[PDB]
Design a protein around this ligand. Structure first.
Ligand SMILES: COc1ccc([C@@H]2CNC(=O)C2)cc1OC1CCCC1
Ligand SMILES: [Zn+2]
Length: 105
């Protein structure tokens, strides 16, 4: 259980070692304006994604950060968001926990 793959296709995405304690915890439970709930895990780093469009501040769940949608690079599944434009760290990834599968390296 040290690495994370896309649950839908197996693409390698991130690692447990890359989890990022944001505001005290790597886990945040948040809602979008369409009322969908997400269990978001924060990572310092991820790979195998494809970032779509340019960043937006609108409805950002993390103060001072702008988001871009992050799809699985391989299958297109929506895995989370890349955050940028902030401070300490400047950037990070918020990934949806139930869209990842955890397993050996
Ligand atoms: C599942 O969709 C989405 C769900 C959630 C957000 C978040 C709101 N606050 C954040 O920190 C990002 C953006 C989305 O993408 C939208 C942009 C255009 C259509 C959908
Ligand atoms: Zn995938």
């Amino acid at each position: 259980a040290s690495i994370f793959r896309c649950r839908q296709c197996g693409q390698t995405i991130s690692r447990r070692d890359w989890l990022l304690p944001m505001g005290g915890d790597h886990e945040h439970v948040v809602f979008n304006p369409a009322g969908m709930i997400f269990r978001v895990w924060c990572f310092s780093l991820a790979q195998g994604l494809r970032l779509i469009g340019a960043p937006s501040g609108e409805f950002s769940w993390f103060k001072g950060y702008d988001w871009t949608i992050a799809l699985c690079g391989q299958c297109g599944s929506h895995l989370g968001w890349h955050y940028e434009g902030g401070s300490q760290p400047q950037t990070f990834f918020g990934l949806i926990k139930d869209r990842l599968a955890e397993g050996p390296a």
